[PDB]
Amino acid sequence: AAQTNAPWGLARISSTSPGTSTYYYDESAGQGSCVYVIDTGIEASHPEFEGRAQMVKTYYYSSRDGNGHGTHCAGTVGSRTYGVAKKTQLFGVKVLDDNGSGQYSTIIAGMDFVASDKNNRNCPKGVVASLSLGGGYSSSVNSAAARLQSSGVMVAVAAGNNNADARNYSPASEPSVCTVGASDRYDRRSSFSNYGSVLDIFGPGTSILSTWIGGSTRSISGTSMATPHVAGLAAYLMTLGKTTAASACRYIADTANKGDLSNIPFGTVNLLAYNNYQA
DSSP: OEETTOOHHHHHTTOSSTTOOOEEOOTTTTTTEEEEEEESOOOTTOGGGTTOEEEEEESSSOOSOSSSHHHHHHHHHHOTTTOSSTTOEEEEEEOSOTTSOOOHHHHHHHHHHHHHHGGGSOOTTEEEEEEOOOEEOOHHHHHHHHHHHHTTEEEEEEOOSSSSBGGGEETTTOTTSEEEEEEOTTSBBOTTOOBSTTOOEEEEOSSEEEEETTTEEEEEOSHHHHHHHHHHHHHHHHHTTSOOTTTHHHHHHHTSEESOOBSOOTTSOOEEOOOOOOO
16 A cells, blocks of 8 residues: 655655655555554544544543643554554553653553553454653663563563663663654654663654644654654554564564764664555
8 A cells, every 4th residue: 555645754664765745555454453542642543543542540540631742643653644654553552641751650550551451452463652751860760661571461662762772761771662863854863852872773763753632734854753654664564464562663673774864873772663565
């Protein structure tokens, strides 16, 4: 399949070259996979989700995404127009309040929630968690992400927007999950993107168009936006039978576009998420 005039990030992950506008993808589109978007929630009513989104857990009275961030990153995973895996199931876990804030304990609880929740879901192609959040280093946050991964969830996490080594940030520094840096449409490392040896992969992160609350769309930037690209790609690749939850991070790195990014600090992978789809 081909989505013309797609967000640059979708076209990027299907192209060996920047500057294209067409997103090429196998029509399976991540069907049979599920992605938990662990964030401010998901406006599941957004037409862009076509009923494939739902809230499964909140840590506030409301499952309603009163921020936009979770709806935005859900959109990049598998929203209709703006998503990588356009047929995947999206589950909303609202660990961040509507200001985007969340206690570590709440984030840890949300990850533990997914690890068991996925046993009440039908995700025959596998299960992904997209964590577009982060704070300073936390061994207990890291171990929460490690458990989720261990449980058989493909965890993707944002490297953080500090223009610093991601070793000082959690869950970004958890080695066993997929730590995602951000690139811009010119294949530069995003200005804010964290870096370091813990990074597993880069994805489009600057000026990413996707869903927003109120049935709308907006473009925002962050490794938080690159994360759902990789989670979507993993859901897509799992549905294709190309990898598993345990191996998706390394499979995406193995098959990534290598050496195409600029301003990658020495010691940080130079790997851009790529679906390698041959139409």
